[model samples]
Target: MNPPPPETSNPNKPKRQTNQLQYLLRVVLKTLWKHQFAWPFQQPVDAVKLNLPDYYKIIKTPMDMGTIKKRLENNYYWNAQECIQDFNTMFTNCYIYNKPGDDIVLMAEALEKLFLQKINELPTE
Candidate 1:
């Protein structure tokens, strides 16, 4: 009888894990986009039209859900942390630009909390 085949190795294990991470990131992003407070964050702030000249100065690196979605679609994110950071950046920008008691700032605070909760629920291993 032929000897039992050697245990097969999964050469694509890392790649598979990355694909899973991408899917998880997509789900998290979609949930955020559907959130009630997400309207203001859906697109980049129109500093020009809004006459907020200092926006770019205060927010050196602008980020928004729409930009994140496009980047995800283009596979621009290298890992989960990168995606999470972008979301954080978006909310942080909101906090920096608006006063603490501002409606947008409040929404951003709530959204950031939800984002943290969702990311924490993800499987680490």
Candidate 2:
């Protein structure tokens, strides 16, 4: 018979360990995409391509592409405060969301689950 493993305080310590987990979560999100746009909370996926970091950025592209459009449409200010907020959110989420893996689909599902768990672990304000 096989035995289960122990838990660690630092889950991200091992590259391969976390990367594989990240990938799995992405798959779960992708499956839910058929349900709606904005990827929902559980709706999305990511590949290990060079643009991965850019995807994590999440704010720069819109600024470059259509800050005016965003401002006009949503009345949101893309200022230093917004930038900092975006950075915090992006970094916090990416810690789990940026899950990587050798296999694309499994890595994705793991990433989704990691994010879900991380979100659940947060203390509400």
Considering every candidate listed, which one attains the maximal lDDT?
A: 1
Local accuracy of candidate 2 as per-residue lDDT tens digits, 1-125: 11121122233442122322333223322333333222222212232333454553443322111222222223233232332243234334444444554343353355445445543432222
Q: TM-scores of all models? A: 0.77, 0.22
The per-prediction tally of clashing pairs is: 0, 22
What stretches of model 2 exceed 4 Å from their correct place?
Answer: 1-102
- Which candidate gets the maximum TM-score versus the true structure? 1
Per-residue alpha-carbon lDDT of candidate 1 for residues 1-125, written as tens digits (9 for 90 to 100): 12222122334433223553565556788888889999988877777766777777787788888877766665665576766788888988898888889988889998898888778766555
Give model 1's TM-score versus the native structure: 0.77
Query: What is candidate 2's local distance difference test score?
Result: 0.32
> Model 1 lDDT vs. the true structure?
0.72
